[PDB]
């Protein structure tokens, strides 16, 4: 289908995988990072049935499957499942076999080297990709947003990274990596919905809660005041339709879950929240850097699409920041989808063609080569 | 750049008028055609239902 | 034949009854359904129509 050896681009998180091709401004398909497996003994004969289901197949057949995520806190722990995801992601929907096209995969700046090494090894030895690159997610977000400078908050399902970049340079001493993420927010919601009389303990139930969160939840500009009314009156409650026709009505839990981003103690996390994490990265940068980072809080990854988050993050930093200074958040509608787009931008830059590891250098050096070549 | 914004308003307002019309007219056409059609279907079914009730009474006498 | 006729007549009645019961529940379905059908789309339409204008500020 393609008339050029454009790189293929994927952003593989602990949640979902966004995929498309280099040179576009959008992914063409999205898959959950899920491989599902039946937990029941077959009784009928001749009904097909796979050993495992991938992506959207895993969710469509989930009624009897246990659903596992191969990626946790930013890294691949199960790469056999990622190979099935990548075949499906690159060839079944995008219709391109990596054998004839370069591939770009992404990681956080401090993501364990073992993960970039496996991403490189898998695409070269299983998919025979002619070339590889593993990209920094923060770089990609800044390209997509039109910035060279800012604090990148990649606040998704796995890990919040929080890295300051200035004039294209990393400022690693100011990175505030935090093990606070969207997967934990979901777990908290499952526990508080349990308190309301709706226990969720199985995979189907877990996926429902993640659906409740995505459709009903928000952070709120002012949590304590929003909670004071939501916890006192039905006027701030919203219902959700459960798959079997039953419904659940949710009050302050609707925003208390997302609030864990600002109050991590809700899940037993030793943290002051994502806005102090952001603030400290600015604080630790040089004094003639700080002004540009205060003016550029960059939103990427999941949770950045909660109602009240763009306004809340600018307000929370303003509250920590010195007066006189202008604090600004970069949070357009195309917010968060900035990391996939950046992968496309980087892969297709003329100034980045020399950064591709070819399947020449790869076999001479082995997968450890990514640590020497990507950045 | 500001021409992008003007183009956005041009398409959105051309769409708005196309929409006010399409939103309303697609419903008035589908909806009035649907009730007119089904007002008749409803009447025809009611007539047939009465006729069958009569037919059943006639068979009961037979 | 008498039993088959009674069963068939009983079934003719039950099946025809089911037919007129369903034609009626269907009419009573569809008719009430078209009300939803004609008003849910017209309300939501006209809401969307109005939105194009509601948003003209």
């Amino acid at each position: 289908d393609e008339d050029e050896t454009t790189a293929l681009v994927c952003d593989n998180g602990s949640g979902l995988v966004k995929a498309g091709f280099a040179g576009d401004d959008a992914p063409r398909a999205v898959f959950p990072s899920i491989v599902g497996r039946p937990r029941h003994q077959g009784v009928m004969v001749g009904m097909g049935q796979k050993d495992s289901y991938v992506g959207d197949e895993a969710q469509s057949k989930r009624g009897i499957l246990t659903l596992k995520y191969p990626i946790e806190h930013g890294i691949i722990t199960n790469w056999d499942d990622m190979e099935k995801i990548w075949h499906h992601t690159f060839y079944n929907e995008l219709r391109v076999a990596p054998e004839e096209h370069p591939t770009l995969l992404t990681e956080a700046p401090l993501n364990p080297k073992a993960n970039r090494e496996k991403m490189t090894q898998i695409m070269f030895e299983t998919f025979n990709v002619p070339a590889m690159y593993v990209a920094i997610q923060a770089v990609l977000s800044l390209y997509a947003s039109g910035r060279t400078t800012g604090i990148v908050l990649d606040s998704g399902d796995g890990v919040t990274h929080n890295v300051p970049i200035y004039e294209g340079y990393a400022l690693p001493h100011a990175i505030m990596r935090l093990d606070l993420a969207g997967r934990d927010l979901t777990d908290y919601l499952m526990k508080i919905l349990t308190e309301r009389g709706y226990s969720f303990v199985t995979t189907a139930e877990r996926e429902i809660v993640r659906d409740i969160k995505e459709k009903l939840c928000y952070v709120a500009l002012d949590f304590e005041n929003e909670m004071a009314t939501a916890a006192s009156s039905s006027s701030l409650e919203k219902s959700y339709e459960l798959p079997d026709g039953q419904v659940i009505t949710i009050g302050n839990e609707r925003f208390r879950c997302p609030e864990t981003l600002f109050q991590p103690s809700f899940i037993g996390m030793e943290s002051a929240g994502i806005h102090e994490t952001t603030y400290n990265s600015i604080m630790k940068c040089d004094i003639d850097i700080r002004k540009d980072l205060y003016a550029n809080n960059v939103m990427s990854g999941g949770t950045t699409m909660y109602p009240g988050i763009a306004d809340r993050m600018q307000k929370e930093i303003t509250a920590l920041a010195p007066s006189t200074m202008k604090i600004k958040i970069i949070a357009p509608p195309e917010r968060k989808y900035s990391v996939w787009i950046g992968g496309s931008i980087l892969a297709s830059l003329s100034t980045f063609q020399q950064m591709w590891i070819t399947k020449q250098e790869y076999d001479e050096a082995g997968p450890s080569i990514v640590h020497r070549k990507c950045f | 750049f500001d021409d992008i914004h003007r183009k956005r308003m041009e398409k959105d307002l051309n769409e708005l008028q196309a929409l006010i019309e399409a939103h309303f007219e697609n419903r008035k056409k589908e909806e009035e055609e649907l009730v007119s059609l089904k007002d008749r279907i409803e009447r025809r079914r009611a007539e047939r239902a009465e006729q069958q009730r009569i037919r059943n009474e006639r068979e009961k006498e037979r | 034949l008498s039993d088959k006729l009674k069963e068939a007549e009983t079934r003719a009645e039950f099946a025809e009854r089911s037919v007129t019961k369903l034609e009626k529940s269907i009419d009573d379905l569809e008719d009430e359904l078209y009300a939803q059908k004609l008003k849910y789309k017209a309300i939501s339409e006209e809401l969307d129509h109005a939105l194009n204008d509601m948003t003209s500020i």
Partner: peptide, 29 residues
Amino acid sequence: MDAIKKKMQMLKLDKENALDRAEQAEADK
């Protein structure tokens, strides 16, 4: 409200930028 989602971004950004300009224009002294 798609019209609003984008008009909202347009006006918040345009007023914030205009306000940032208003504030700087005076603040620069």
